[PDB]
Symmetry: D2
Subunit: 505 residues, 4 copies
Amino acid sequence: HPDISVDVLVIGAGPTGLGAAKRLNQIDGPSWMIVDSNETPGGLASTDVTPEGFLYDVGGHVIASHYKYFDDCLDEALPKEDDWYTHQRISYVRCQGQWVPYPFQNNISMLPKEEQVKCIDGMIDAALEARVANTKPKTFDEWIVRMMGTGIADLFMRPYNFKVWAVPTTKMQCAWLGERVAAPNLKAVTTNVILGKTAGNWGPNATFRFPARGGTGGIWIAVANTLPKEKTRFGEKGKVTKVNANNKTVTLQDGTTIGYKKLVSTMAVDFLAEAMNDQELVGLTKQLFYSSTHVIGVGVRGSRPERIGDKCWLYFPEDNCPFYRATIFSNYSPYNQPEASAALPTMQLADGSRPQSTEAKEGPYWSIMLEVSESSMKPVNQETILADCIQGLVNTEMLKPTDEIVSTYHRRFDHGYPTPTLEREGTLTQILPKLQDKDIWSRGRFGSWRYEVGNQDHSFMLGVEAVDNIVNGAVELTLNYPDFVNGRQNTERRLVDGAQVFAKS
Amino acid sequence: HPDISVDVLVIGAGPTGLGAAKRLNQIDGPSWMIVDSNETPGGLASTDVTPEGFLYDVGGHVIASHYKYFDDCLDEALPKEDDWYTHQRISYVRCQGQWVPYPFQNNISMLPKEEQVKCIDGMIDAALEARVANTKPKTFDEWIVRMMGTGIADLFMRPYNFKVWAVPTTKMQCAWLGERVAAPNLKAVTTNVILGKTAGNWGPNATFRFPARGGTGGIWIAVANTLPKEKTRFGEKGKVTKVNANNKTVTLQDGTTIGYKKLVSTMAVDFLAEAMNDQELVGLTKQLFYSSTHVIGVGVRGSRPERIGDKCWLYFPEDNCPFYRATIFSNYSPYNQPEASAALPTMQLADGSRPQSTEAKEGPYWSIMLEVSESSMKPVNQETILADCIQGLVNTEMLKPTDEIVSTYHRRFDHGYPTPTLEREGTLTQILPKLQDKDIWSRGRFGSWRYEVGNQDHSFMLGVEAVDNIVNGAVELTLNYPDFVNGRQNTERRLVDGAQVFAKS
Amino acid sequence: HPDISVDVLVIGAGPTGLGAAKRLNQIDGPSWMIVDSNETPGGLASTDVTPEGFLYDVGGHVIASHYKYFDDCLDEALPKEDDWYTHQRISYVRCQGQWVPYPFQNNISMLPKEEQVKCIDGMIDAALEARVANTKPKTFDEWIVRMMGTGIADLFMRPYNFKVWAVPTTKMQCAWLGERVAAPNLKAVTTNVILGKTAGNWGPNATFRFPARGGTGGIWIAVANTLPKEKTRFGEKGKVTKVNANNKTVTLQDGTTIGYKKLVSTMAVDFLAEAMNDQELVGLTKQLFYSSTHVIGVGVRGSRPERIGDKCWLYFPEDNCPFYRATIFSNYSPYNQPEASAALPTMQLADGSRPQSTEAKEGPYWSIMLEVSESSMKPVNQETILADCIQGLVNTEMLKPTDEIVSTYHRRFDHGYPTPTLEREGTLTQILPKLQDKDIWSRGRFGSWRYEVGNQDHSFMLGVEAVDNIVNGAVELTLNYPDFVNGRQNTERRLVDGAQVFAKS
Amino acid sequence: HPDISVDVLVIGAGPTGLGAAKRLNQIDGPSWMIVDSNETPGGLASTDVTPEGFLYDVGGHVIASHYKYFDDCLDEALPKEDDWYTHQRISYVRCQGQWVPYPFQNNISMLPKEEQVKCIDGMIDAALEARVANTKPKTFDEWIVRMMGTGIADLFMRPYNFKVWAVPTTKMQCAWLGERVAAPNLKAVTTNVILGKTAGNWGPNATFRFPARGGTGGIWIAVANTLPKEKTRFGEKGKVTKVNANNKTVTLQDGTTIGYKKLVSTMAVDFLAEAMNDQELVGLTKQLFYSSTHVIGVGVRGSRPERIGDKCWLYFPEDNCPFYRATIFSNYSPYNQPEASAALPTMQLADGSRPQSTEAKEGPYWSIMLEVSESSMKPVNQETILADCIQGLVNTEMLKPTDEIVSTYHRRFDHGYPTPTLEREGTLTQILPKLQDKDIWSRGRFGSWRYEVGNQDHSFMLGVEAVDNIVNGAVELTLNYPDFVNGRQNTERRLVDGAQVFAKS
């Protein structure tokens, strides 16, 4: 007989696990507990801080919620207006010395006329081909070229997406992009070119909110704080080392055994297969592909440069920098970096030189957060990637040679992106139903490995819907139908449902 | 204060209302009750019997279930193998003296060669147009011609659907038919013509089960008998006469008032509007279109004629009979008509003659169930429709002039089919939200008025999902996404869910 | 017995008849004779001169030769290099205050940006339609809109062609335009728009030669002068008044009778039918459509204005002027107008004002030749057309209000354009075979009524080929296959053929 | 000074050279002379006779005249009604044990139904592709598949054409087939399949005439007889051995020298290059490709078998016979083989065995003429080809094993077909203009090497038009525009033109 017995055991307290726990808590029927090897919940949605007081998320995290249930829980966790800042969704592509507003194709009037000609000719071919197309594209690369044409594809989406996925676009599927037919809006693109118009896809109605304090990790700390503590086990004490699916027993690092009826596992499924000592599954999970993420943080002395302005995140297709995305993290909250009166010495100049003077000088400060991908098809030299990133900031005119860097951050995350390879779905249909047949709900960014439902809200709801399926027989829509959940406002499920209203009365 | 108060009130005990009742009874959380103006539950899924012992459903009723939950409840209601009979889904189209197997286009080798040429040429045109189509059809008629071509459309789907819907195909939408592209399978059609092949879309895998006793109506009597009797109020004592949405009170025939927190209403929504005394809603619901259904039943003396054989239902595009559909109801269960040793006099011969003898003679017996539509665009003479129907049986060679009729049946159902007109959605998206804002879930074949989810299983699940939405925040998938639920096996929701399992432990 | 008898009689000494005569004279086999009612040969390719010394062709006459035989005869007639001037084929379209280089669609970068967007959107639509087109256009109007799209059609070719043909584009065929697929060159058009580029279809190799003296008329006088005079009868003494097809006799004005074996008639075929007193033929030729041509000439004091420059001819789609085409005739030869030292009084200013002085003043001078079309569907007030033309010159900014007019010219030509109506070929294929059966070769711009082979070189060659058919059994290629002769340089037939070479030896 | 000087010298007295001769003779202007190495005119349009009295043309020769001039000369040469037999153009394809009427695709209803399905499926694919096709086919093979689809292509046009051209279809151009769009008539093919219908492309209006006596060669002997004998030089005395293009002198085998001004050469252009000792031309003409033709004749004892009947020529795509075409040559004229009273011994039975009796026996007799192609890509065993052909006749059921063969014939013609390879035009546009500049008109089946104008009428007219271009400056239409002459009735040029009429008077 195990040390602990619950109806539903949740493994992992990132957004997916916390989601399962929140729904389990709301329903308040079956017994449950949640474990995590980390003392701080949040997983890849956590936040680090440098010794100099600069916060960094695990790369650019911007919330775009598809669900009221997610909203309810974030509101409960951080109920004050002062707990959040709101920003418009401002992003640009760096291309040929210019900041081109996203979406790229609507803004190519910024490029030289000769480049515009190439882009439009390319898009005209794609329009004419789309007119007689009667097959769906089979790879990411095909989808891109059918949408954009060759010229526009080559300038942005093709090289950018290799830099992101660390695999060629020709090796990825394209179903994860949704149901929209791959064809250009030639009229829109030519119209902006003719008018000499630029326009970004943001405005007063395209916004996101970011926690005032603690970065994205502040959300999951606060969400986890609403749970009954005695149903949690976070830290070394909650590290899972063995899963015996046949016995329905989990063994923790310290020897504790937990017997479960149903298991919601949100750890990476390849980790799960190993903990299961299941050779068949280890074999299958090894067929999945993923990239690692290097997060580089740079803290900079000065008031925010005009050339930076209200930019939020930024895309880099070109090979004059190693990162694919930059985030002006200091724009997200004034509390992501020290107050202006905090005194810090200059660590280095952006040109790589180190000043002799160790004088601590005041701010204000701003902060850049960068991401570099790694895979078996794209190695990263860990010893030089910080300096290479900083030179990249100089090349892209984000930093002047003389800008004073007062803090640096670098951390490599092993499981960063689950890759939508051509083989992904075939491998998953062998893995997830096998786990299902053992009453294991493997869910989450790497729990179920689908990037198209791999954001914070998706992950949260993968956990919530897994519990809802377990308890109430609900359809796991986010898991099986990403296009369905992503194409609608999901408003039906709420932190207070009729069940709780009727019960209280 | 009202005579009775419940959390959830369900009006109507046809399949939709019984679905709501079943799910409420399973959840066993919020209080509830169900009412009906009829002492016998079933609604349009009920069964009548003639004084001579011939059963008739409300027209051809064949179960094609898309949900496990539905199956669960039917298995619970009628658990014995002896409670059901299984049959292949056998149907034909009556065309030019021939019984053409369904689907019609795959079987036109039974037509004159010169006619096959016109059909194939028509479909060739449709195939060539479909290759370069860049728009969806906007009407049912356009959908039909794009799928079949002019020649085949004119033989079956165009005149048949006018006879069913009592409105022209050009006046109806086609979104209700689902997301499949409107285009011909030219090779399938030419292949069967070249091979001289006939092929029906049935066999060992394509079957349905039909209740052994009491007709389709026996299902719903049995399902209702699983409910706690005291939460039911069926008969004149259960007839709703007034709905006060602002006070959340319902008034019954006998003066009884019921207070509710949430209302699931499964009566026709135009009747609901009347019972609410809501002028705006009455205005809107009057803009909805529907057809009435005449059901004609004919009991015939004799063993099953060879020409009839194992036929189940039959379509009639042509103008030599008033019915659009016939069902060989005696093929569905040997208990839909009297036993062979039951003695009955011949009422008339099929050509209308008097019988040579008026004394009771034994069987065996077989039985035909016919349907005739009526609308403001297609009147039906009630005084002569029985006689016209019987003449139709002769014209279509279903009866010989000498066949002996031993029982007749005629009944008119006012609300028969909810019509997918071009205007339907424009109207419903004005009605259903207004009811929703008053905590009224109006659901069902005429509760929510959508034929594409208008079968028994759809209706049951509309009730089930409305409750699940009320109590558990579930998405009402059947109501809002017909294509979703009809395109998948809906297996997640069960009559015993996790909630009930964990509760008992 | 007639007064004169020849093997081949040619009626008319315009280009077509002179072609017949040149070939007859070269062959020197059958006896022959050519007549004309005008003392001066040249027909519609003749030239008038005002009392003040300004020459005017019959509207813009620019030579574009498809035949070396035509070239040979022109070289023979006017052999000196001093006999000709060479110019680039410089043309513009007047649109919205701008001189837009031809071809119009390649130069819409000159238009307002909002208009460019509408133009490009229309041509995108045409490009996409053209990709799936499986039918030929059936009218001139369809041809135009399929080539240009709605926006560009509406700016130039649709209104301009009404002004030219004096019938709507919807009433004309399009076979006469050749074999080219009706489809846009979207890339060409978008590229110049993107580049902000203009480009006319002319250059050092896109030229024409014009006679130094006597206008276009000087060519045909010189060509006719190479013929044996005694075989020509030009003037009142050459006016044909009756053609007895049955007796192969022609009666002239003065009563001279001419017997022939074969007749080449180059007069208008409706006049020929009348001269034949052939009722059936009069009816048929009456079904042919044609427009009349008003030629207006304006002589202007001053050196060539900068705004005019090297412009040759000009197209006018808009309604602020009655003419469809303008020619800067002073640019074709310095001898089309008086020398600078010639003294002329100012007749009026361009705004209609009297001059300050009526004294004869010196030049230099320049000159504009205008064309206005007339038909039953487009009446022309002959009393006001000159004044309206001059106002149109001010409206289009060809003339300043202050420009001094020193000579005016106006002549109406009854048969100006033979119209490619939808009915043209139905009618011609009844007329030409009947004439042929009587050994009458009716040929020429109105002799056979086909505009697509209606220029000077076509006409000349129609005469030549008619003779070559009569004598040598040659195919009349220009007559029956416009696309054939227009799509090649016809090099085989020369003014000195093998026959004359072998004979001289 | 050469022995003989003429204005125009014609080398070769096949149809092309005779055409040149007839036109020169008609014009009666320049002096001329025609030479041939054979005593008998006709070339590949000649006829051999076996020692047993069986005539054979050089393979099946059936006249289909596009020209009135050709008709004129044939009528002059053979003026009597009994100089000719008229037959319908009856042809069949041998395929899977059956004679299928030509055109094959309209008659596939004769094939097994499953095979019809594959044929129609293939043609449906090709129709759908043709609906969106915007490129011309570039090879003969692409052309075939676009017209027929894969299934039908593989049954007839692909294997047959390899057997004809002795090169794969993928190695040939397709321009030579004309301007018709490469696309199936799906409706016509499926219609005959549906109706179970067969129809050949012949009847009372689809006929050919054949000379009563002497085979096809009788025509050209007769045409030659109309020429002034002293201007002909036929046999060893007329064999050209050397051409000196710079001196314009031809040397004959007997040493005779002929000076010319213009040369019409109708020998194979690769032979002409050799005779010119022009190494550049030798190299060029070696790039042309041709196949050799083996003609096999089989004379058979008996009245014409019913299984043969009225068949004229027959196509053989399959591998059970080496010949590609058979002609029932005894059907073309009763004088193509001996009268029934002629006594001949049986040489062998068709199964290869010796005859029972070696005695001369009476007829009647019938006769089969076969063609086998050979090239560097398709070698032929010349030692066994007669036996292989005879066995081929047994395999195809044209002959019974017991049929008595009384005569056999085999002759290999080295230049048989000029092959429309992909390279042909690139080579010919270097050859023919180079010869042209030297005043050499190289014309004819191998004179100018274009099979699409390679029949008797084409050839004849290539000669006629060469002369007409040399003397009258005519366009060489047949040479340069095959689609033009083939697509019309060429009626303008006659054996008596106006020139001869006007001169006689």
